[PDB]
Amino acid sequence: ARATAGEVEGSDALRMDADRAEQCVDALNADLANVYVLYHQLKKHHWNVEGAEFRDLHLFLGEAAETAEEVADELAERVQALGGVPHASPETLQAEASVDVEDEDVYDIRTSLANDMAIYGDIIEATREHTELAENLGDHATAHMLREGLIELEDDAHHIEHYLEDDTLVTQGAL
Amino acid sequence: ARATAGEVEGSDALRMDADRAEQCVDALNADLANVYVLYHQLKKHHWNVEGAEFRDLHLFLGEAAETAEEVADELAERVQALGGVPHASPETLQAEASVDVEDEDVYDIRTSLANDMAIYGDIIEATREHTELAENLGDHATAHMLREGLIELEDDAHHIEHYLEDDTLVTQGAL
Amino acid sequence: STQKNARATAGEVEGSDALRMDADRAEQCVDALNADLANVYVLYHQLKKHHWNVEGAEFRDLHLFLGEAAETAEEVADELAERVQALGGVPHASPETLQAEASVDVEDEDVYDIRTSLANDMAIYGDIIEATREHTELAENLGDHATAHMLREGLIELEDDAHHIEHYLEDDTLVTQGAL
Amino acid sequence: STQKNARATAGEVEGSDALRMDADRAEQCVDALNADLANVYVLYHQLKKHHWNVEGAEFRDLHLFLGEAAETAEEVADELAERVQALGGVPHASPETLQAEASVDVEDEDVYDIRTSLANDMAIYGDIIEATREHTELAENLGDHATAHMLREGLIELEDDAHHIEHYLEDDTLVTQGAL
Amino acid sequence: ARATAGEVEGSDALRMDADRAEQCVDALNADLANVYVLYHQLKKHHWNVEGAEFRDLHLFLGEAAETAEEVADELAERVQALGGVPHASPETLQAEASVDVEDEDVYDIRTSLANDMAIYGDIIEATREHTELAENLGDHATAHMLREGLIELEDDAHHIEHYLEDDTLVTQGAL
Amino acid sequence: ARATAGEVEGSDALRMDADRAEQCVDALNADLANVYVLYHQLKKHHWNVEGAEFRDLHLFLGEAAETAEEVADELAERVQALGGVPHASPETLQAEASVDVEDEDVYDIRTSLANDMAIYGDIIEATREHTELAENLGDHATAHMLREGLIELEDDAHHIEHYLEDDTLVTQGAL
Amino acid sequence: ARATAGEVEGSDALRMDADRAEQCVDALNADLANVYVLYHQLKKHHWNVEGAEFRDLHLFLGEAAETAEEVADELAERVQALGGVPHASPETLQAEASVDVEDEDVYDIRTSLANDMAIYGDIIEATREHTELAENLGDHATAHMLREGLIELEDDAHHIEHYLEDDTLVTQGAL
Amino acid sequence: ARATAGEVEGSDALRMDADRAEQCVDALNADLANVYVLYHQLKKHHWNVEGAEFRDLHLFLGEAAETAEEVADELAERVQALGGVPHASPETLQAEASVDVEDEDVYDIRTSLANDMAIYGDIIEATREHTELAENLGDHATAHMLREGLIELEDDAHHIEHYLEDDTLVTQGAL
Amino acid sequence: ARATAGEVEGSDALRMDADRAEQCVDALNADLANVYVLYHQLKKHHWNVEGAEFRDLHLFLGEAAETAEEVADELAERVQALGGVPHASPETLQAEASVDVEDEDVYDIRTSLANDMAIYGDIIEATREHTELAENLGDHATAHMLREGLIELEDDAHHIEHYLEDDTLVTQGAL
Amino acid sequence: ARATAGEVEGSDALRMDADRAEQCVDALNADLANVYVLYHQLKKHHWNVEGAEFRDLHLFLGEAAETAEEVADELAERVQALGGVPHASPETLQAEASVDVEDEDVYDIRTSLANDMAIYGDIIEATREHTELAENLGDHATAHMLREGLIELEDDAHHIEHYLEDDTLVTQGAL
Amino acid sequence: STQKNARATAGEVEGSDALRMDADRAEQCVDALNADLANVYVLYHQLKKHHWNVEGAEFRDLHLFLGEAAETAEEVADELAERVQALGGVPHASPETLQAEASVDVEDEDVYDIRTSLANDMAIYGDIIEATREHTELAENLGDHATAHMLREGLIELEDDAHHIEHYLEDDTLVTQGAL
Ligand SMILES: [Fe+3]
Ligand SMILES: [Fe+3]
Ligand SMILES: [Fe+3]
Ligand SMILES: [Fe+3]
Ligand SMILES: [Fe+3]
Ligand SMILES: [Fe+3]
Ligand SMILES: [Fe+3]
Ligand SMILES: [Fe+3]
Ligand SMILES: [Fe+3]
Ligand SMILES: [Fe+3]
Ligand SMILES: [Fe+3]
Ligand SMILES: [Fe+3]
Ligand SMILES: [Fe+3]
Ligand SMILES: [Fe+3]
Ligand SMILES: [Fe+3]
Ligand SMILES: [Fe+3]
Ligand SMILES: [Fe+3]
Ligand SMILES: [Fe+3]
Ligand SMILES: [Fe+3]
Ligand SMILES: [Fe+3]
Ligand SMILES: [Fe+3]
Ligand SMILES: [Fe+3]
Ligand SMILES: [Fe+3]
Ligand SMILES: [Fe+3]
Ligand SMILES: [Fe+3]
Ligand SMILES: [Fe+3]
Ligand SMILES: [Fe+3]
Ligand SMILES: [Fe+3]
Ligand SMILES: [Fe+3]
Ligand SMILES: [Fe+3]
Ligand SMILES: [Fe+3]
Ligand SMILES: [Fe+3]
Ligand SMILES: [Fe+3]
Ligand SMILES: [Fe+3]
Ligand SMILES: [Fe+3]
Ligand SMILES: [Fe+3]
Ligand SMILES: [Fe+3]
Ligand SMILES: [Fe+3]
Ligand SMILES: [Fe+3]
Ligand SMILES: [Fe+3]
Ligand SMILES: [Fe+3]
Ligand SMILES: [Fe+3]
Ligand SMILES: [Fe+3]
Ligand SMILES: [Fe+3]
Ligand SMILES: [Fe+3]
Ligand SMILES: [Fe+3]
Ligand SMILES: [Fe+3]
Ligand SMILES: [Fe+3]
Ligand SMILES: [Fe+3]
Ligand SMILES: [Fe+3]
Ligand SMILES: [Fe+3]
Ligand SMILES: [Fe+3]
Ligand SMILES: [Fe+3]
Ligand SMILES: [Fe+3]
Ligand SMILES: [Fe+3]
Ligand SMILES: [Fe+3]
Ligand SMILES: [Fe+3]
Ligand SMILES: [Fe+3]
Ligand SMILES: [Fe+3]
Ligand SMILES: [Fe+3]
Ligand SMILES: [Fe+3]
Ligand SMILES: [Fe+3]
Ligand SMILES: [Fe+3]
Ligand SMILES: [Fe+3]
Ligand SMILES: [Fe+3]
Ligand SMILES: [Fe+3]
Ligand SMILES: [Fe+3]
Ligand SMILES: [Fe+3]
Ligand SMILES: [Fe+3]
Ligand SMILES: [Fe+3]
Ligand SMILES: [Fe+3]
Ligand SMILES: [Fe+3]
Ligand SMILES: [Fe+3]
Ligand SMILES: [Fe+3]
Ligand SMILES: [Fe+3]
Ligand SMILES: [Fe+3]
Ligand SMILES: [Fe+3]
Ligand SMILES: [Fe+3]
Ligand SMILES: [Fe+3]
Ligand SMILES: [Fe+3]
Ligand code: NA
Ligand code: NA
Ligand code: NA
Ligand code: NA
């Protein structure tokens, strides 16, 4: 084995001793697993959303899933750069995720979206925490990447919140 | 006149005798008719869609019309390449169409969409039969082009079906 | 006079020698275009407002529509301002001035539902379209065909937005009581 | 029944009236495509894993290859999932489900050397290719030529990746004992 | 009314209670109004700049105005995401702006630019302050967006400073 | 010879008899001449501009030449479409031009620019009259194309006028 | 030597045993040779076409060469992937082709294009059988590629048939 | 006046003394004049070409004009850079050209293209000598530019020779 | 002299008094010199890398050098914006660099890369330090730019680390 | 036959008599042969490269084949423009080639590469002689095109030479 | 010898067998190109310097011009370095080496006004152009037409920059005492 899950060696290139590195890696791994379940649930909703607004949502959800995917990729790579091993198999990603994930049934779009927003909220707070963690270890690259992915995660979280708001152009009339 | 409607001459270039070619031509030209009436009816719905979801549907139906148009173009070009005469005038297209065609009035969006979905379904079933028929004649290029257009037609048809499904983000609350 | 600090005084129109447009004709266009610039920039700010705030089942489509509609208004206002300058006048500039010179009705700072918001934008669009229609004839009658042509170029875009908001507000939807 | 909260139950296939595919035929494809989706999404996660972790003399070329190969798998899985939905079934979704429904062999969480990792991806690719080959005939025999065509479109890409990993693993190199 | 100017509800999606949110929203709103007057004064100068260097300045000022516009947009959207109401009408934006705004006369380019730079300076210091505010509330997305717009605002502020410096290629000779 | 300079034949395709067409042709061909001499003189100024602002003016005059060239192209094509013979040789272009044309020496930038501005102004006034003349003949396409070229010519002319205005960032200080 | 011409080892990666693989290979290589001489012949005709319609044909022939080149590449790369040795040197490619190839003199453009046409037809018929062969061996990726290359070949052969058709805008008049 | 036609001051920047510079200038200007009348003649032919092959020739002639235009620009800009005055007005350009220019009547397309061809050949031979001249003066940048312009001129002259070649897809049959 | 090396005047535009500014400028200048030696050593290795993996490394090293170049540019510009003078001549950049730089011999790729990674490590730690410096002076733009360049510098540092890891696809077998 | 292989007619358009043209033609056609066999052999190596570095080499050899192909195209077009007949069939290309051509077996990568490098070297030396020969005939366009292709051929040849050099990131450690 | 650690020694030229250029001819080009690389890289650093620092009425146009002019020099130096390597020599690399091997005059670390700065760049450009002119003949006389052609490709760009700086410095301007 080149590396053992859970081993964190830091990096001589990046002058981050294993001690500091393992504190970021533990936090980014936790992020990774959550963000990857988020991606797979966004994919799910993307695939399955139906009804009057489905095309727009479909497009939104596919974009959102692309954005979680990229954030996952940046996390896992950071992990590795810090001498860690990013969670990889689907089983591992779900087991190490703390966020709640829907069972295999398909739910209606409102429920589906409120479940996604719950996920985002938990990721967003965790992420805020890890960025202060990274800055306090002086890992400013990690903190900068966490904030760069945060602002995209909150923009999708906020979109979803707007989808779920109590307004519409529909009227009883048109019904 | 350089060629007479209905005639099929095959093609020496393509090493397709008129007797095989007539078989695919008669099938392709009937596809052409139905696709071009589909194209016109999508155009109609694109122009006329109104209401809470209209911009999205407007784009979608635009794109589906462009897809229909390109399919029709490929079918007509293929008919010509096999030495046949592709149906051309709008009056002939509609007259050769087997699918149902709305009258000039403008129906509401769910009615229009369900009318389009029924046209898609007839086109999809005929296309499936035509691809078999082309493979059986060893006209693999034809069969191929039919599959390549089929998967586009099926994706549009499936999107319409999603639009019509019984889900929505709208709640009585928001109404 | 040689000694104002101001390069130009608000309200002065000086025509252009480059453009062979004397001050007399210029003033007639610049009066029209300034008044439009003011309305189109309040339109732009209200569309932004509605882009920012729209929520609910159709929000993302509206959010993008309304941002594109603000962009178009922005571009229209930029043309009209540049035209007023090219004609030797002073385009309305500060936000206060722009709203004060606008004749359209502007929402107060509360956020309303999307149908109310769209209806209010619709109303501004219409005012601007009737006015732009007038100003184009005005400009053609002055022989200022550049300005006329520009007014029509921007009119076609404003009417396209206005008409989209009209469709958004129409009584139809895919939604059924069933799926409710 | 009118009263499940679930819009759809995992494992139900309902065909599509749009697509003129009754539930009987649909179920046969959706069974095949679901099983593929599961394998292709575990493939995708393992390629990502190997993209993340590859190191050594050839790492940057492999890192880019393996990221492009994950992207392709991702796109393949997205097609297959969308197809399963279009056919009125429920594509496997959660990571746990996807791995549980995968028949391919997946590496444990340790990181292995690049030859071991590539070999393991190679093995998944092959399984997926033999299966996809079957499913394409399956689909053509059902007259579901759209699905068949899509399976072939994605098969050509998967085979191209599989074959590249084969070349990466071949016994040749520019490296000489000399330069060692 | 869906929302009242001045109301700040936080966001459940973004796990930001109204208490913390109202401290960012108050600061971003203040920013918004200033940045929107800045945009309208940049537009003004863009439109009106004349003389030997006017084309370059025109281009620079239009770019600068585009950049303030985008920053405004990111601010107002953040505000909304935080459950606030971003200042919207032109009247409101100018009244809530703290920066000084030129009267409707047109001034020469040097004066015009020195007035713009004053604006930028006030926005830049405010923005620095709000970013420490956001980080201290642990709103790291807001802080990250503030810094992302800061660095573009200081780059334009600095350009303007260079335009106004005491150098030129011109010589008495050439005059 | 396929056609003789001066002749105008109208066009059957365009349903424009030679008697209406001659009227627009004589106007368009006089525009063509003046625009092509404008184009050459902009080229000249583009090649020769020197001094503190030269790169900017160099680009500008380049672009304005390209605009002039495209206008000339549209005018000449239109003349041809109306069955006329567009003036072609450089000697004929200049000879048919009514505008003033610098001699071969190179003047300073303000002189050159003011010479161009005077050419623009003559072209703008003639274009305005030609558009009226075309609308009055019911040649709306012509009138349209003239308006579309006019607004470009007017914007270049206005830019030159801005260049010549009595403002600058330069101060005696910096000198 | 790493591999010997004519040997075909299949592929473990693609789960194609040597037996099935030798079948597709022997067909794909014989295509490869024909398609590469086609490529060189189109290049020839591309280089040499002269006369009234030369620039158009020059562009079409260059494109048709490029299409043949890419078909050749896909063929050869498939052969390799199946564990075979694609024919490589020019003399091997012409020796293994079954199509007729013009001698090194240059023929007028009708004769040249008629000869290409003969070449396309032969390739097209071969490709059709090979697609059937690959499908029958269950080598779907190979069949799918041959169909993809086929529709481009057929499009080309068909364009050449149109070039050669007995119509023209020319009239005696214009002679 | 800033510079006087015919004067050539060299360049200190380019370390080209007036003597060497006057040599390249006198050659480049005489190219400039010829290439600009070439440009206007191609424009003419572009505008006027009619008949069976007109759209293709129209596109080729427009491109060939654009190529000549850019060659002219590079020539004139080099002259300027060498401290000379590039010929500018249309009447100067035709007066200083040594090529033959068609009168203002419109000739059929063979005659028109034969005349262009005469013009290209003369320019091509001149350019060849000038490249030799520049190299001999050690003015490598000038020679390198002339070669770069030359290969594009030659490509054009050669296309015209192909247009005029005695072949065609037309047959009596089709007449 | 407009400015003296080492003088730092702050900026009125950016409301950064010279006192605070000189603390960032001193730190960014140190960064600049190091990052510019890094760029010149990356260029070196880019140019000279040979052997089995050279093309990929070449591409990687040229990209890395482009990224250091951009970071240098952002540093030097910040310096200037803060009223400082960025180190400019090559001599000055090397003298003020603290990182070790290879002599003019060419070393093998492994050695070359391990020398580069040493450089990156020193720059990365310095950069982390300066970002906390900038944040503590409330220069949040500087801190934001430092982090934006940090994350690219650590990504290259980490790549290099991966190149140097003890894995390969090579086997004794293949040797 | 429109032209007979070997004949060279020069060109009137290009003012190149057959006696000068034959000299460049005989040289260009021998280049063409060797370049097209180079192209085929690069194709071969592209298809067949395997092992630790294969993807990179695969791309490289692909690109170098495309470069070879474009060089061959330019050489053949030039031969045609000078009134010669470019060698066309694959059998003639190889037969006219003076370079060595692998037999059909597939060699290992270092052997293949060194075989290509030897073909490059013969082509580079001949090209150098041909450029001299073209300049001496005053065929500057030819000489130019040869230099423009030479520097591409030399860069590919130099890249192959880099691939073959005795360095690597691989260590016995990693083995 | 088998045992230097250095792969190549600075100053050694070994020709290339790939390029069929023996060491004797190569050395003559590599001497010329190295000397140019050094000057062009000091040019690049001084243009950067002036891009960074230019201020005043025309600064943004100059800032962009001078950044594009540095980019071109950078690209020129990269060609020349790669060429020196391709010819089996060792391109000057460290900043110290590059300036030490440069024959051009380089500004001290103070910032001068834009006319002084431009004049100083102009002076470097000229040196480089006269030298490049020589080296191109040198290379053609050696029959190294690739190098000659590359020298001319980069010469045309350097002369275009040099000539632009010449225009920037010319005695003309739109500015009048009036507007002063
Ligand atoms: Fe769907
Ligand atoms: Fe994605
Ligand atoms: Fe990645
Ligand atoms: Fe990584
Ligand atoms: Fe690692
Ligand atoms: Fe970013
Ligand atoms: Fe970004
Ligand atoms: Fe609420
Ligand atoms: Fe509509
Ligand atoms: Fe369409
Ligand atoms: Fe279309
Ligand atoms: Fe078509
Ligand atoms: Fe036909
Ligand atoms: Fe056809
Ligand atoms: Fe396709
Ligand atoms: Fe249902
Ligand atoms: Fe905008
Ligand atoms: Fe915009
Ligand atoms: Fe503007
Ligand atoms: Fe003005
Ligand atoms: Fe328009
Ligand atoms: Fe228009
Ligand atoms: Fe109604
Ligand atoms: Fe993706
Ligand atoms: Fe993707
Ligand atoms: Fe999708
Ligand atoms: Fe569904
Ligand atoms: Fe495809
Ligand atoms: Fe396809
Ligand atoms: Fe202006
Ligand atoms: Fe903007
Ligand atoms: Fe926005
Ligand atoms: Fe928002
Ligand atoms: Fe909200
Ligand atoms: Fe950013
Ligand atoms: Fe960023
Ligand atoms: Fe960014
Ligand atoms: Fe100062
Ligand atoms: Fe110039
Ligand atoms: Fe032009
Ligand atoms: Fe042009
Ligand atoms: Fe034209
Ligand atoms: Fe005509
Ligand atoms: Fe026409
Ligand atoms: Fe237009
Ligand atoms: Fe004044
Ligand atoms: Fe082997
Ligand atoms: Fe090609
Ligand atoms: Fe290939
Ligand atoms: Fe292989
Ligand atoms: Fe395809
Ligand atoms: Fe016929
Ligand atoms: Fe002077
Ligand atoms: Fe042009
Ligand atoms: Fe130019
Ligand atoms: Fe000059
Ligand atoms: Fe070029
Ligand atoms: Fe002949
Ligand atoms: Fe190299
Ligand atoms: Fe770079
Ligand atoms: Fe910069
Ligand atoms: Fe700066
Ligand atoms: Fe400064
Ligand atoms: Fe960024
Ligand atoms: Fe970015
Ligand atoms: Fe290790
Ligand atoms: Fe291969
Ligand atoms: Fe190619
Ligand atoms: Fe190609
Ligand atoms: Fe070609
Ligand atoms: Fe010929
Ligand atoms: Fe030719
Ligand atoms: Fe080139
Ligand atoms: Fe060695
Ligand atoms: Fe660069
Ligand atoms: Fe670059
Ligand atoms: Fe490079
Ligand atoms: Fe080397
Ligand atoms: Fe070039
Ligand atoms: Fe070139
Ligand atoms: Na809705
Ligand atoms: Na100035
Ligand atoms: Na013809
Ligand atoms: Na290797």
mmCIF file of C-alpha atoms in Angstrom, chain E residues 117-118 120-122 124-125 128-129 131-132 135 144 147-148 150-151 154 157-158 161-162 165-167, chain I residues 2 9-16 20 74 77-78 80-81 135 138-142 144-145 147-148:
data_model
loop_
_atom_site.group_PDB
_atom_site.id
_atom_site.type_symbol
_atom_site.label_atom_id
_atom_site.label_comp_id
_atom_site.label_asym_id
_atom_site.label_seq_id
_atom_site.Cartn_x
_atom_site.Cartn_y
_atom_site.Cartn_z
ATOM 1 C CA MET E 117 -10.950 58.514 -6.243
ATOM 2 C CA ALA E 118 -12.351 60.055 -3.098
ATOM 3 C CA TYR E 120 -13.232 54.723 -3.959
ATOM 4 C CA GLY E 121 -11.144 55.565 -0.920
ATOM 5 C CA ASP E 122 -14.176 55.751 1.315
ATOM 6 C CA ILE E 124 -12.257 50.843 0.214
ATOM 7 C CA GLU E 125 -11.862 51.635 3.954
ATOM 8 C CA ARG E 128 -11.836 46.600 4.743
ATOM 9 C CA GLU E 129 -13.914 47.235 7.907
ATOM 10 C CA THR E 131 -14.555 42.268 5.944
ATOM 11 C CA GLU E 132 -13.255 42.099 9.460
ATOM 12 C CA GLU E 135 -14.949 37.303 9.516
ATOM 13 C CA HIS E 144 -14.532 36.223 0.945
ATOM 14 C CA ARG E 147 -12.253 40.781 -0.410
ATOM 15 C CA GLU E 148 -12.943 39.577 -4.017
ATOM 16 C CA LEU E 150 -12.131 44.838 -2.732
ATOM 17 C CA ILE E 151 -9.246 43.856 -4.770
ATOM 18 C CA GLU E 154 -8.537 49.036 -5.196
ATOM 19 C CA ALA E 157 -8.821 53.304 -7.354
ATOM 20 C CA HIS E 158 -5.073 52.775 -8.027
ATOM 21 C CA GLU E 161 -4.339 57.526 -8.953
ATOM 22 C CA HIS E 162 -1.962 56.745 -11.841
ATOM 23 C CA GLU E 165 0.157 61.440 -11.368
ATOM 24 C CA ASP E 166 2.612 64.115 -12.432
ATOM 25 C CA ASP E 167 4.078 62.514 -15.430
ATOM 26 C CA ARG I 2 10.031 60.111 -9.823
ATOM 27 C CA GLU I 9 4.467 56.735 0.177
ATOM 28 C CA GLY I 10 1.264 54.828 0.834
ATOM 29 C CA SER I 11 -1.717 55.850 -1.202
ATOM 30 C CA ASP I 12 -4.334 58.489 -0.724
ATOM 31 C CA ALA I 13 -6.578 56.638 -3.225
ATOM 32 C CA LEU I 14 -6.482 53.449 -1.299
ATOM 33 C CA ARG I 15 -6.507 55.158 2.190
ATOM 34 C CA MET I 16 -3.399 53.388 3.269
ATOM 35 C CA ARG I 20 0.921 50.590 7.259
ATOM 36 C CA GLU I 74 0.264 40.995 -9.002
ATOM 37 C CA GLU I 77 1.680 46.000 -8.877
ATOM 38 C CA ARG I 78 0.450 45.896 -5.331
ATOM 39 C CA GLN I 80 3.361 50.174 -6.553
ATOM 40 C CA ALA I 81 -0.282 50.654 -5.644
ATOM 41 C CA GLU I 135 -4.959 40.975 7.504
ATOM 42 C CA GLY I 138 -6.470 45.500 7.874
ATOM 43 C CA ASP I 139 -5.099 45.468 4.244
ATOM 44 C CA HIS I 140 -7.668 42.895 3.237
ATOM 45 C CA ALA I 141 -7.090 43.398 -0.512
ATOM 46 C CA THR I 142 -3.479 42.477 -0.087
ATOM 47 C CA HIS I 144 -6.984 38.366 -0.489
ATOM 48 C CA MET I 145 -4.458 38.643 -3.352
ATOM 49 C CA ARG I 147 -4.184 33.901 -0.697
ATOM 50 C CA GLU I 148 -5.290 33.867 -4.400
#
